[PDB]
């Protein structure tokens, strides 16, 4: 959420009576609330080394944000004219979103003061000028009230100038550990979000996102370089829309996580699990033999907890195939719902060291992947070969073992 | 019915934490909607002790205004601003899927929302991007009317009560009056203000009378049929006025300040003349500033007489939702009289309660997981009950809040002040085998109509346990009946000593 | 630097008359029904009056929505109808060829104190435009015959692709990308988002209509598999193949 | 972000004399570009002895700035705006200019000359100084400002400034240290001709700072604090030669819910267990900590060596805490270690409280993470956050797996290497750890190897969670009992399975279900079920139940095997 402003006031450097609060909204708020303009007056109107900077300090239980501005010209008295649009917030908040708005407001009023002296002539006092060669209070009222109510304003101050402030939330930057073996999901419908302003790559990535395409597969399908796909996926993560996942095989080591009790403690997880994992009709895949009407929630919970750290998906499916045939359960959707709800995870396979003649580039990237202890997934993606061929190539290259972590 | 409401004519103050910047009232007079950045809260006025129904919609920007739909055929529609879009809610749906359709007009934040009093399915929205849009609920795809001031952000939009296609908008220090037949060119641009215009309003019975508030403490009354400039009347106060609205009964107007004053709503009789403010009644209280004030209506169903009584609902920044009764002296000082004959019968609204959650191949019927244990223990119920002040101990709700705060280790399974049902769990040393160990109980409580007034005690019912013998059950029930029978003779509240005794902490006499 | 330039700031506005939404626009295709406006803010005026120049520019920019979004109606009123065209579909080549009208004739009237006729274009895009093929050819053939340097400056962040980028369709309706050799692009100014997602930045799409509609596709038979072991082996055998 | 990063750039020692505020000592003299992106007898003696610990990259030619300039600001101006008035002193001074949070706790004298309420230039400066300030310069990101600044002020600055104010109040130390720093600066800049012969500004600054650290004691403390908080290490500071303060910022390396390392990065080798240290620290503001066993995170001699810096002289704390470290093993509960306290000093005894305090001290200062009393009868799997990939702990050039394999071979050369030993624990189904042991002659060495693996976070423990189930036969049976006080077919593949989530929190019919579930088993099974029904909620591990309730493991096996078709097994960390 956005913190409401507590008190806005406009300081100015009078060349005779010093720094003072010219206008303040709400009126007499600082004196009523205990804020005194005699302790931090040296930061609001500072010496010209701290000027044109976003000064922010803490006063008691109130955090004070300001952008002092000093203009140097011989027209003004004492060759200087200093003011400050000061924003006061309670300390226990986050003043991050208002900081660019305060900086831009100070910069805009500095530009207007340098252009046509909009803020110096508004005092109606010739003591601010050399003398030898619009209401601020209403503007403060409108700024305070519009930023408290709407978080936006289109406040006019002249015939061609307007205070246009919009407050945006601050978002965390995305991860950098995204690779070619991670499949991107899409928690939002990316078809209706596309408009004319999108990146050309990000237009092409959207159709090939269904929870089963690897990033290199998306890059090859859409004729894209993997780096720009990485950047576009990072941008989609930045808006909290796309979450990475794992390539689904039948040789995976899927295991229950510590959130397997969420399948009982969430009232809306198992009910969607019944409808999600079921084929639309009586599919023929639920009629093949092992060798030659919706599912019960208890059956699904027993099937989730049947996985273990070392039982591959082939062994689990050939050990439990009557249950997944009578209930008409799609095994890929069954695994994908568990992975999406973070109730089961995947134990990755690591080929740590102790056939057709492949090319020199293939063996070079194989050695580079082995030296960095990369998983079987990344080697399979880079070589465009399945697990058995990679294992045979590695066994021809040297002795090695698999770690299921 | 409205005439069996226990909170009309009595001063009551809620406590709704969360920073709600909007409020609106059901025209039936039972529900109140509150808008925040997280969504909506719907509160039953007749039973404030029930926790509010929560509809989820998370937005970063603060909501501007909310308005209940006055259309009698659809009393389940609530329109609230969500930054640049307006959301028409549906209370008949689920709590998590209450959004029906969203108006995708404008380009910046929506500022105010008002309904047409003559055509209750026509909606007007004003926004910060100088656009005033008129919507239709039958085809909510595009606006059928668009107009702008091109200079300043709008602040309020209001329809004309008499002329159905005249709407006014306030844009800074200048207020415009648009006409749907003409469009984009105002009938009159009333320019008499010095500071910005905060509120705009229309007279209910007058055709062309307009009242606006201002930041410089000037309330100016207009009659734009005579002259666009100047004002018919000007009232000067000592504070900026945030919302100034006409009285619904008689001749008068009520104004309140954004800052300054005593943070109270001032009521002024109305029976070119600059003058000073002379209020009749000031609703003293509300230590922080007031967000909005609402009017609650209550009249007979098929009668032809203006016998309605009015209550004022104020929502303020201090998280207090107060109810202000209106005495007969206010009905006398303001020119309000009970009409012997009515030209038109008043509209009749359905007096429903939109607070309880509605009920909502082929699946097989089963009980996958036990409902108990999956339950979340109601600790928000005690906090909600601690913030209701009707008129030491006053009613059942304050007693339940007091025993909830006094014993944090007593888990409440079911709290219902309105139906006098109270099911709670505790652990107590009541085993004939080992007195040191504790036995889990699920004691349910039923209260009569007059719980502390008469000598009638609560009737305690305890669910059966194999750990609890018949002798212990009889002893506990007889002792609780003795405590309730003895302790209501002084007309006090017997729920603290009963729970303390069942917990085994002490003995009282 | 104490220069004596002669500035000439002019607007150039293209209006989209059609009522079709911007999401329904094919990339590489120019707007069909469009109207072009040109508003000259200041004529040839020396930069020593820069205060008046910026005042006129601010007033004219703040009074540009009323001059175009309102239209005169014969009935007796005005209608707030009309929408600005986006940058990608904007008339960039029309600005380029509108600038090359004051230099067309070599024997024009001589500016006796100024020599160069540098032209700058300020755009709120990211160097991505949709152009017509014949207009691009004519623009290039004209711009390689006159003494103008055009320095397009963008007010947005530099995108991931190369700039300037033109998307266009050929006579056989195939999308093509080309980078012109007569335009130079400047950008006016951890991790910085270089891609613009407007519907998610401003939260313009609500919660209930943003849910996913296309889930993970169901498994399929190959019409050659007899047992579940064979299907598992075939799925693991083709888990990394690209069609 | 769970990655530890104390965004520190420098420290200041700003004092306010009656002649104006001034900067006495700031340790890092580097510029903004690097930071954001008898002559030498005692000096060389202390440098070789190791008492002068000071980084050298701060004094390189490409990473050096003048002493009078601090981040494009002069020393006088920084001393000015970091010296507030009386109303902004004795509290936080969170000052931000532009991505530079000047943070500190100024200590100002009261109305009297009291610093706190219960050579002759040195005494003059002690009687003339009215305010001293320790200002920390930080540059946190805009999304973690309220976290970084708050944790730094909570864990380092507050305690450091309070100790400085106390020691200044009793026996004037900051006055004396500032006086000797200024005197040494005067003696180096104007005298001590070895300084003039040095070529290079960076080496000149290095020599000046070396002389300052050799003469001063507070300067060494500030230098060590900057160099060790930046390195995310425990900083031990010697103040006034009689008291020492240990300063750290806590590291989140313990996890329970398996954070998504693909999106939010996690330290490799983080202890992914449902038994956490942090659930015992917050409880010190049920379960007893004595039941668990302490697993040392380093070798005991190195732990003793690090424990020799937590106290200037050997008090009773660093005797008991040294003896406990020398006589601890990660295979026995802490209840059995009462005899060590009993012999070294003369239920609810004070020995138990002393042992609790010592365990908290050991597991807070990154020395000994507490665990379950590891045996060969438990199930151990490879954790998903195993330190396999990455060239270091926080990489995100040899990966950690081969480095730790080298360490494993060096420490344990009579057993198979780390890849073989890890592949034996992950390829097959997770069983008891004793099935890897070939003979009883290799049991303690394999217990040491397992303790090392849990120490490095490679291997976690697979705990057993038991959930109760009730089928339709029990429902019909309790329906018949309630009667004591479709229909054409019998499809045998349908079972109206109902899971009781909380057996303790259940209704009458649900408790009837659970009690009818046992109707037929003998008396021992009935007693074991009635004493352990409330723990079948799917959240309490059965190993902790065995430890707490003092029951046999074979009794649990009997209870599980007898009720085979009504107990749900859940196996996770």
Task: Transcribe B99-118 into DSSP letters.
Answer: EEEEE---SS-EEEEEE-SS
Phi, psi of D249 (to 5 degrees): -110, 125
Flag if A156 and B109 touch (Cβ within 8 Å). no
Question: Resolution in A, one decimal?
Answer: 3.2
B130 close to B148: Cβ distance less than 8 angstroms: yes
Name the residue among C195, C139, C196 with its Cα closest to residue C166.
Answer: C139
Q: Using DSSP bridges, classify how beta strands B252-257 and B241-246 pair: parallel, antiparallel or unpaired.
A: antiparallel
- Please, which residues have CB within 8 angstroms of residue C168's CB and are 6 or more apart in sequence? C28, C130, C131, C132, C133, C136, C175, C176, C178
In whole angstroms, give the CA distance from residue A120 to residue D512.
85
Contacts with B375 from chain D: Cβ below 8 Å: 505
In whole angstroms, give the CA distance from residue D356 to residue B18.
42
Taking the Cβ of residue B4 and every Cβ of chain D, the question of whether any pair is shorter than 8 Å is answered with no
Inter-chain Cβ pairs, chain B and chain D, closer than 8 A: 44
In whole angstroms, give the CA distance from residue B315 to residue B290.
6
Subunits with 3+ Cβ pairs within 8 Å of A are B, C, D
Task: Transcribe chain C into DSSP letters.
Answer: -----EE--B--EEEE-S---GGG--TT---SSEEEE--B---SEEGGGHHHHHHHHHHHHHTSHHHHHEEE-TTSSEEE--EEPPSTTS-HHHHHHHHTTSSSSTT----TT-----EEEEESS-SEEE--HHHHHHHHHHHTTS---EEEEESSPPPSS-SSEEEEE-TT--EEEE--SSEEEEE-------S--HHHHTT-S-SGGGS--S-PPPP---SS--SHHHHHHHHHHTSS---
Taking the Cβ of residue B144 and every Cβ of chain C, the question of whether any pair is shorter than 8 Å is answered with no
Contacts with B367 from chain D: Cβ below 8 Å: 496, 498
Flag if B259 and A26 touch (Cβ within 8 Å). yes
Q: Residue written as tokens 């070798």?
A: D299
Name the residue among A387, A378, A403 with its Cα closest to residue A182.
Answer: A378
Would you tell me the crossing angle of helices D121-128 and D174-189 to the nearest 10 degrees?
Answer: 130
What is the SS3 assignment for B33?
strand
**What are the DSSP E strand ranges found in D412-493?**
459-461, 463-470
Q: Using DSSP bridges, classify how beta strands D368-371 and D380-382 pair: parallel, antiparallel or unpaired.
A: unpaired
In whole angstroms, give the CA distance from residue A175 to residue A231.
10
In whole angstroms, give the CA distance from residue A40 to residue A35.
10
Distance of CA B277 to the CA centre of its chain: 29
Query: Rounded to a whole number, what is the distance in Å from the CA of C79 to chain A's nearest CA?
Result: 23
Q: Using DSSP bridges, classify how beta strands A244-246 and C175-178 pair: parallel, antiparallel or unpaired.
A: unpaired
In whole angstroms, give the CA distance from residue B460 to residue C11.
82
Taking the Cβ of residue B350 and every Cβ of chain D, the question of whether any pair is shorter than 8 Å is answered with no
What is the SS3 assignment for B378?
coil
Mutate to test the interface with C, among A250, A254, A385 (most CBs of C within 10 A): A250
In whole angstroms, give the CA distance from residue B101 to residue B105.
12
Six-digit token pair at D132?
């001293």
Q: Considering only residues 153 to 182 of chain B, which have any Cβ-Cβ distance to chain C shorter than 8 Å?
A: 182
| Region for B217 from its dihedrals, namely left if φ exceeds 0, alpha if ψ lies in -120 to 50, beta otherwise | left
* Closest chain A residue to B291, measured at CA: A149
Give the Cβ contact number of residue A346 at 10 Å: 22
Mutate to test the interface with B, among C20, C58, C84, C206 (most CBs of B within 10 A): C206
Name the residue among B214, B134, B234 with its Cα closest to residue B178.
Answer: B134
Q: Residue written as tokens 């934040």?
A: B109
In whole angstroms, give the CA distance from residue C71 to residue C53.
28
Flag if C226 and A288 touch (Cβ within 8 Å). yes
Flag if A138 and B215 touch (Cβ within 8 Å). yes
Flag if B151 and A156 touch (Cβ within 8 Å). yes
Distance of CA C170 to the CA centre of its chain: 19
In whole angstroms, give the CA distance from residue B257 to residue B241.
4
The approach used to solve this structure was cryo-EM
What is the SS3 assignment for D298?
coil
Taking the Cβ of residue A354 and every Cβ of chain D, the question of whether any pair is shorter than 8 Å is answered with yes
Flag if B150 and C77 touch (Cβ within 8 Å). no
Q: Considering only residues 14 to 73 of chain C, which have any Cβ-Cβ distance to chain A shorter than 8 Å?
A: 22-23, 25, 27, 51, 54-55, 57-63
Phi, psi of B177 (to 5 degrees): -125, 105
Flag if A345 and D88 touch (Cβ within 8 Å). no
Instruction: Work out whether the CA dihedral A249, A250, A251, A256 comes out positive or negative.
Output: positive
In whole angstroms, give the CA distance from residue B393 to residue B73.
42
Subunits with 3+ Cβ pairs within 8 Å of C are A, B
**How is residue D521 annotated by DSSP?**
B
Name the residue among D449, D382, D390 with its Cα closest to residue D422.
Answer: D382
Q: Is the peptide bond before B447 cis (omega within 30 degrees of 0)?
A: no
Flag if C54 and A196 touch (Cβ within 8 Å). no
Angle ∠(B80,B82,B87) on CA atoms, nearest 5? 50
Inter-CA distances, D295 with B26, C202, D373, D377, Å: 64, 51, 9, 18
In whole angstroms, give the CA distance from residue B479 to residue B501.
9
Taking the Cβ of residue A203 and every Cβ of chain C, the question of whether any pair is shorter than 8 Å is answered with yes
Flag if B370 and D499 touch (Cβ within 8 Å). yes
- Please, which residues have CB within 8 angstroms of residue D434's CB and are 6 or more apart in sequence? D376, D377
- Please, which residues have CB within 8 angstroms of residue A8's CB and are 6 or more apart in sequence? A24, A25, A85, A86, A87, A88, A140, A143, A144
**What are the DSSP E strand ranges found in B408-472?**
411-416, 421-428, 439-441, 444-446, 459-461
Nearest to B60 among A1, A146, A278 (CB): A1
Q: Considering only residues 98 to 127 of chain C, which have any Cβ-Cβ distance to chain A shorter than 8 Å?
A: none
Secondary structure of C87-129 in the HEC alphabet? Answer: CCCCCHHHHHHHHCCCCCCCCCCCCCCCCCCCEEEEECCCCEE
Burial B311-339 (b: 16+ CB within 10 A, else e): bbbbbbbeebbbbbebeeebbebbebeee
Six-digit token pair at B447?
């209260």
Taking the Cβ of residue C226 and every Cβ of chain A, the question of whether any pair is shorter than 8 Å is answered with yes
In whole angstroms, give the CA distance from residue B373 to residue D505.
6
Query: Rounded to a whole number, what is the distance in Å from the CA of D409 to chain A's nearest CA?
Result: 12
Burial of residue B444 (number of CB atoms within 10 Å: 0-12, 13-18, 19+): middle
Six-digit token pair at B290?
């007031």
Name the residue among B123, B116, B120 with its Cα closest to residue B161.
Answer: B116
Taking the Cβ of residue A1 and every Cβ of chain C, the question of whether any pair is shorter than 8 Å is answered with no
Q: Which residues pair with D181 in a beta bridge?
A: none
Flag if B368 and A270 touch (Cβ within 8 Å). yes
Flag if A193 and C197 touch (Cβ within 8 Å). yes
Torsion angle of alpha carbons D487, D493, D494, D498, nearest 10°? 150
Query: Rounded to a whole number, what is the distance in Å from the CA of D383 to chain A's nearest CA?
Result: 6
Secondary structure of chain A in the HEC alphabet? Answer: CCCCCCEEEEEEEECCCEEEEEEEECCCHHHHHCCCCCCCHHHHCCCCCCCCCCEEEEECCEEEEEEEEEEECCCEHHHEEEEEEEEEEECCCCCCCHHHHHHHHHHHHHHHHHHHCCCCHHHCCHHHECCCCCCHHHHHHHHHHHHHHCCEEEEECCCCCEEEEECCCCCCCCCCCCCCCEEECCCCCCCCCCCCCCCHHHHHHCCCCCCCCCHHHHHHHCCCCHHHHHHHHHHHHHCCCCCEEECCCCCCCCEECCCCCHHHHCCCCHHHHHHHCECCCCCHHHCCCCCCCCCCHHHHHHHHCCCCCCCCHHHHHHHCCCHHHHCCECHHHHHHHHHHCCCEECCCEEEEECCCCCCHHHHHHHHHHHHCCCCHHHHHHHHCCCHHHHHHHHHHHCCEEEEEC
Angle ∠(B418,B29,B71) on CA atoms, nearest 5? 130
Give the Cβ contact number of residue B38 at 10 Å: 17
Inter-CA distances, D185 with B249, B373, D133, D176, D180, Å: 85, 71, 20, 14, 8
In whole angstroms, give the CA distance from residue D143 to residue C152.
34
Q: Is the peptide bond before C164 cis (omega within 30 degrees of 0)?
A: yes
Distance of CA A1 to the CA centre of its chain: 16
B36 close to B19: Cβ distance less than 8 angstroms: yes
Run of H or E residues at D246: strand D243-247
D103 close to D7: Cβ distance less than 8 angstroms: no
Instruction: Work out whether the CA dihedral B393, B397, B399, B403 comes out positive or negative.
Output: negative
Inter-chain Cβ pairs, chain A and chain B, closer than 8 A: 85
Six-digit token pair at D244?
């020492």
Q: How many CA atoms lie within 13 A of C176 on its CB side?
A: 14
**What are the DSSP E strand ranges found in B376-478?**
389-390, 411-416, 421-428, 439-441, 444-446, 459-461
Name the residue among A120, A35, A103 with its Cα closest to residue A68.
Answer: A103
Torsion angle of alpha carbons B365, B367, B368, B374, nearest 10°? 140
Burial of residue C62 (number of CB atoms within 10 Å: 0-12, 13-18, 19+): middle
Flag if C65 and B148 touch (Cβ within 8 Å). yes
Query: Rounded to a whole number, what is the distance in Å from the CA of A110 to chain C's nearest CA?
Result: 14
In whole angstroms, give the CA distance from residue B386 to residue B402.
8
In whole angstroms, give the CA distance from residue A405 to residue D387.
10
Nearest to A261 among D260, D495, D539 (CB): D539
- Please, which residues have CB within 8 angstroms of residue A346's CB and are 6 or more apart in sequence? A246, A252, A253, A254, A255, A339
D437 close to D401: Cβ distance less than 8 angstroms: no
Flag if A405 and D388 touch (Cβ within 8 Å). yes
- Please, which residues have CB within 8 angstroms of residue D553's CB and are 6 or more apart in sequence? D377, D546
Give the Cβ contact number of residue B504 at 10 Å: 14
Inter-CA distances, D284 with B188, D249, D281, D310, D325, Å: 72, 19, 5, 22, 22
Q: Residue written as tokens 């910046």?
A: B108
Nearest to D507 among B369, B374, B463 (CB): B463
């Amino acid at each position: 959420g956005f913190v409401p402003i507590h008190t806005i006031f406009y300081s100015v450097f009078h060349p005779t009576e010093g720094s003072k609060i010219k206008y303040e909204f709400p009126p007499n708020n600082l004196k009523n609330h205990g804020i005194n303009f005699n302790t931090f007056k040296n930061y609001i109107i500072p010496k010209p080394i701290l000027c044109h900077k976003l000064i922010t300090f803490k006063y008691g239980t109130y955090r004070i944000v300001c952008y002092p501005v000093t203009i140097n010209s011989p027209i003004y008295a004492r060759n200087f004219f200093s003011f400050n649009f000061v924003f006061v917030f309670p300390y226990d908040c986050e003043t991050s979103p208002y900081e660019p708005a305060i900086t831009r407001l100070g910069k805009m009023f500095k530009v207007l003061e340098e252009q046509n002296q909009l803020l110096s002539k508004s005092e109606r006092d010739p003591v601010f000028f050399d003398l030898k060669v619009f209401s601020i209070q209403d503007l403060l009222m409108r700024i305070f009230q519009d930023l408290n109510n709407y978080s936006e304003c289109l406040i006019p101050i002249d015939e061609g100038n307007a205070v246009d402030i919009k407050i945006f939330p601050l978002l965390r930057p995305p991860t950098t550990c995204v690779s070619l073996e991670d499949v991107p999901l899409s928690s939002v419908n990316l078809k209706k979000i596309i408009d004319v302003n999108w990146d050309p790559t990000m237009m092409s990535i959207v159709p090939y996102i269904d929870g089963l395409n690897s990033i290199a597969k998306i890059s090859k399908l859409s004729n894209s370089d993997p780096g720009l796909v990485i950047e576009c996926i990072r941008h989609l993560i930045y808006y909290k829309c796309v979450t990475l996942s794992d390539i689904f095989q039948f040789s995976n080591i899927y295991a229950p996580s510590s959130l397997i009790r969420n399948f009982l403690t969430d009232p809306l997880m198992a009910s969607d699990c019944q409808s999600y994992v079921t084929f639309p009709e009586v599919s023929k895949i639920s009629n093949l033999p092992l060798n030659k009407f919706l599912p019960t929630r208890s059956c699904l919970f027993d099937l989730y907890r049947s996985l273990s750290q070392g039982q591959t998906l082939k062994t689990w499916y050939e050990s439990k195939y009557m249950i997944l045939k009578e209930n008409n359960i799609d095994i890929r959707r069954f695994i994908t719902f568990g992975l999406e709800k973070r109730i089961i995870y995947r134990c990755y396979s690591f080929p740590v060291m102790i056939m057709p003649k492949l090319s020199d580039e293939e063996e070079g990237i194989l050695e580079e992947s082995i030296r960095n202890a990369e998983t079987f997934d990344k080697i399979c993606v880079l070589l465009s070969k399945p697990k058995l061929e990679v294992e045979s190539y590695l066994n021809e290259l040297g002795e090695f073992k698999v770690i299921n972590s | 019915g409205p005439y069996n409401s226990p909170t009309f004519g009595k001063s009551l103050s809620l406590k709704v934490d969360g920073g709600f910047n909007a409020v609106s009232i059901n025209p039936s007079g039972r529900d109140i909607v509150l808008a925040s950045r997280q969504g909506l809260y719907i509160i039953d006025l007749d039973d404030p002790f029930t926790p509010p129904r929560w509809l989820h919609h998370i937005t970063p920007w603060q909501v501007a205004d909310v308005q209940w739909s006055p259309h009698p055929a659809k009393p389940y529609w609530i329109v609230s601003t969500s930054n640049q879009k307006a959301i028409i809610w549906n209370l008949a749906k689920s709590s998590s899927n209450a959004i029906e359709f969203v108006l995708h007009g404008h380009s910046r934040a929506i500022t105010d929302i008002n309904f047409n009093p003559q055509h209750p399915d026509v909606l007007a929205t004003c926004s910060v991007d100088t656009y005033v849009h008129a919507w239709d609920m039958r085809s909510p795809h595009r606006p059928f009317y668009s107009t702008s001031s091109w200079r300043s952000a709008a602040s309020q939009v209001k329809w004309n009560y008499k002329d159905p296609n005249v709407l006014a908008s306030s844009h800074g220090n200048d207020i415009f009056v648009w006409d749907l037949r003409k469009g984009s060119t105002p009938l009159c641009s009333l320019k008499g203000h010095v500071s910005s215009v905060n509120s705009i309003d229309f007279n209910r019975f007058k055709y062309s009378e307009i009242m606006s508030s201002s930041n410089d403490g000037t309330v100016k009354f207009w009659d734009y049929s005579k002259s666009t400039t100047e004002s018919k009347r000007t009232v000067t106060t000592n504070f900026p006025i945030w919302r100034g609205r006409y009285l619904p009964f008689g001749e008068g107007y009520c104004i309140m300040p954004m800052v300054g004053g005593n943070n109270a709503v001032y009521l002024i009789n109305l029976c070119n003349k600059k003058t000073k403010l002379q209020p009749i009644y000031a609703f003293k209280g509300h230590s922080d500033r007031v967000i909005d004030f609402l009017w609650r209506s209550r009249h007979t169903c098929d009668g032809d007489y203006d016998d309605r009584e009015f209550q004022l609902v104020t929502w303020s920044k201090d998280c207090d939702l107060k109810l202000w009764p209106i005495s007969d002296s206010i009905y006398g000082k303001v020119n309000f009289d009970r009409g012997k004959r009515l030209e038109e019968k008043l509209p009749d609204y359905d007096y429903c309660s939109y607070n309880k959650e509605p009920e909502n191949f082929r699946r097989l019927r089963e009980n996958f997981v036990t409902t108990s244990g999956l339950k979340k223990n109601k600790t928000n119920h005690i906090t909600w009950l601690s913030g209701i002040r009707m008129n030491k101990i006053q009613n059942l709700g304050e007693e339940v809040s007091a025993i909830g705060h006094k014993f944090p280790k007593v888990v409440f399974e079911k709290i219902s002040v309105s139906t006098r049902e109270l099911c709670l769990t505790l652990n107590g040393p009541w085993s004939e085998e080992n007195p040191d160990d504790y036995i889990f109980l699920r004691i349910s409580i039923n209260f009569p109509l007059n719980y502390p007034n008469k000598g009638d005690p609560p009737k305690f019912t305890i669910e059966e346990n194999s750990n609890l013998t018949m002798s212990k059950r009889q002893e506990i029930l007889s002792n609780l009946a003795t405590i309730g029978q003895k302790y209501t003779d002084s007309n006090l509240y017997c729920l603290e000593p009963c729970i303390r005794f069942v917990l085994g902490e002490k003995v009282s006499l | 630097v104490d220069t004596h330039h002669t500035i000439t700031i002019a607007f150039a506005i293209s209006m989209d008359l059609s009522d079709t939404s911007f999401k329904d626009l094919t990339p590489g295709e120019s707007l069909k029904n469009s109207q072009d406006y040109f508003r000259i803010v200041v004529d040839q005026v020396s930069i020593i009056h820069w205060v008046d120049i910026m005042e006129t520019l601010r007033e004219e920019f703040m009074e540009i929505r009323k001059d175009l979004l309102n239209k005169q109606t014969d009935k007796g009123y005005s209608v707030a109808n009309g929408r600005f065209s986006p940058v990608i579909k904007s008339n960039f080549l029309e600005l380029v060829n509108f600038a090359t009208t004051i230099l067309t004739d070599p024997f024009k009237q001589l500016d006796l104190r100024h020599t160069t006729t540098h032209v700058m274009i300020i755009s709120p895009g990211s160097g991505l435009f949709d152009v017509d093929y014949s207009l691009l050819r004519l623009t290039g053939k004209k711009l390689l015959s006159l003494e103008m340097t055009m320095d397009l400056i963008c007010l947005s962040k530099a995108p991931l692709h190369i700039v300037p980028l033109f998307r266009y369709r050929d006579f056989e309706n195939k999308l093509h990308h080309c980078v012109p050799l007569w335009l130079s692009v400047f950008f006016w100014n951890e991790w910085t988002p270089r891609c613009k997602i407007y519907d998610l930045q401003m939260m313009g799409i609500t919660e209930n209509e943003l849910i996913r509609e296309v889930d993970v596709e169901y498994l399929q038979l190959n019409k050659k598999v007899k047992s579940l072991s064979e299907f598992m082996n075939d799925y693991d055998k083709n888990a990394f193949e690209v069609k | 972000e769970c990655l530890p990063n104390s965004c520190l750039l420098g420290v200041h020692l700003v004092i306010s004399t009656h002649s104006g505020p001034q900067i006495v000592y700031h340790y890092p003299p580097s510029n903004t570009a690097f930071l954001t992106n008898e002559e030498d007898m005692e000096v060389s003696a202390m440098l070789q002895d190791g008492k002068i610990s000071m980084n050298e990259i701060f004094f390189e030619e490409e990473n050096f700035q003048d002493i009078n300039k601090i981040l494009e600001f002069d020393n006088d101006f920084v001393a000015e705006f970091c010296s507030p008035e009386r109303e902004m002193c004795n509290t936080r001074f969170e000052f931000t200019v532009d991505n530079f949070c000047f943070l500190g706790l100024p200590i100002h004298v009261d109305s009297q000359g009291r610093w706190r309420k219960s050579e002759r230039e040195k005494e003059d400066l002690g009687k003339n100084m009215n305010m001293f300030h320790v200002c920390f310069v930080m540059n946190p990101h805009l999304i973690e400002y309220n976290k970084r600044i708050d944790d730094m002020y909570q864990f380092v600055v507050t305690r450091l400034s309070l100790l400085l104010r106390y020691v200044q109040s009793k026996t004037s130390y900051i006055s004396s240290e500032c006086h000797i720093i200024l005197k040494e600066k005067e003696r180096v800049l104007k005298h001590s001709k070895t300084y003039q012969s040095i070529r290079g500004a960076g080496n000149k600054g290095k020599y000046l700072y070396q002389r300052i650290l050799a003469k001063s004691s507070l300067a060494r403390a500030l230098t060590e604090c900057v160099d060790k908080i930046q390195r995310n290490e425990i900083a031990c500071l010697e103040i006034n030669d009689d008291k020492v303060i240990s300063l750290q910022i806590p590291i989140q390396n313990e996890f329970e819910k398996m954070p998504n390392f693909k999106l939010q990065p996690v330290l490799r080798g983080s202890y992914l267990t449902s038994i956490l240290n942090m659930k015992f620290l917050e409880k010190s503001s049920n379960d007893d900590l004595l039941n668990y066993a302490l697993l040392l995170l380093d070798e005991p001699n190195n732990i003793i060596s690090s424990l020799e810096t937590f106290s200037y002289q050997d008090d009773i704390g660093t005797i008991i805490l040294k003896h406990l470290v020398r006589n601890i093993q990660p295979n026995i509960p802490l209840r059995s270690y009462r005899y060590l306290i009993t012999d070294l000093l003369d239920t609810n005894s004070l020995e138990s409280s002393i042992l609790r305090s010592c365990a908290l001290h050991l597991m807070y200062w990154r020395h000994a993470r507490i665990v379950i009393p590891l045996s060969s009868k438990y199930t151990y799997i490879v954790s998903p956050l195993a330190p396999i990939q990455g060239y270091t702990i926080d990489d995100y050039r040899v990966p950690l797996i081969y480095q730790n394999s080298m360490l494993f071979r060096s420490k344990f050369p009579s057993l198979p290497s780390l890849p073989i030993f890890l592949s034996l624990l992950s390829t097959d189904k997770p069983q008891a750890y004793s099935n890897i042991i070939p003979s009883r002659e290799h049991k303690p060495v394999y217990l040491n190897a397992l303790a090392w693996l849990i120490q490095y976070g490679y291997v976690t423990q697979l705990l057993t969670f038991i959930n109760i189930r009730v089928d339709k036969h029990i429902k019909m049976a309790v329906d018949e009992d309630l009667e004591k006080e479709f229909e054409y077919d019998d499809p045998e593949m349908q079972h109206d399975y109902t899971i009781i989530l909380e057996p303790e929190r259940a209704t009458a019919i649900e408790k009837r279900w659970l009690y009818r579930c046992i109707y037929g088993q003998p008396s021992d099974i009935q007693i074991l079920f009635n004493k352990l029904l409330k723990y079948f909620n799917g959240k309490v591990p059965m190993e902790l139940v065995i430890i707490k309730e003092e029951i046999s493991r074979h009794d649990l096996k009997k209870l599980l095997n007898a009720l085979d078709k009504y107990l749900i097994e859940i196996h996770h960390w």
